[PDB]
Short mmCIF file of N, CA and C in Angstrom, two decimals:
data_model
loop_
_atom_site.label_atom_id
_atom_site.label_comp_id
_atom_site.label_asym_id
_atom_site.label_seq_id
_atom_site.Cartn_x
_atom_site.Cartn_y
_atom_site.Cartn_z
N UNK S 1 -15.40 -20.75 120.10
CA UNK S 1 -16.46 -21.76 119.69
C UNK S 1 -17.05 -20.95 118.71
N UNK S 2 -17.49 -22.54 118.25
CA UNK S 2 -18.52 -22.28 116.68
C UNK S 2 -19.27 -23.45 116.74
N UNK S 3 -20.78 -23.02 116.86
CA UNK S 3 -21.60 -23.58 117.09
C UNK S 3 -22.64 -23.86 115.69
N UNK S 4 -22.34 -24.38 114.52
CA UNK S 4 -23.26 -24.12 113.61
C UNK S 4 -23.35 -25.79 113.04
N UNK S 5 -24.26 -25.52 112.16
CA UNK S 5 -24.62 -26.70 111.63
C UNK S 5 -25.76 -27.68 112.28
N UNK S 6 -26.16 -26.75 113.48
CA UNK S 6 -27.44 -27.32 114.31
C UNK S 6 -28.63 -26.15 114.28
N UNK S 7 -28.07 -25.40 113.63
CA UNK S 7 -29.19 -23.93 113.50
C UNK S 7 -29.89 -23.88 111.46
N UNK S 8 -29.35 -25.03 111.05
CA UNK S 8 -29.32 -25.22 109.52
C UNK S 8 -30.26 -25.98 109.01
N UNK S 9 -30.86 -26.81 110.08
CA UNK S 9 -31.51 -27.93 109.62
C UNK S 9 -32.94 -28.04 110.12
N UNK S 10 -33.03 -26.76 110.98
CA UNK S 10 -34.54 -26.53 111.49
C UNK S 10 -35.29 -27.62 112.25
N UNK S 11 -34.52 -28.26 112.92
CA UNK S 11 -35.35 -29.65 113.49
C UNK S 11 -35.90 -29.09 114.77
N UNK S 12 -35.89 -27.94 115.16
CA UNK S 12 -36.77 -27.68 116.06
C UNK S 12 -36.69 -26.08 116.34
N UNK S 13 -35.09 -25.59 116.97
CA UNK S 13 -35.02 -24.22 117.00
C UNK S 13 -35.68 -23.60 117.70
#
C-alpha cells in the first residue's frame, strides 16, 4: 500500500 499525497499538503497532519 502507498498512502502518499496526503502528507504533502499539510492540511492538518
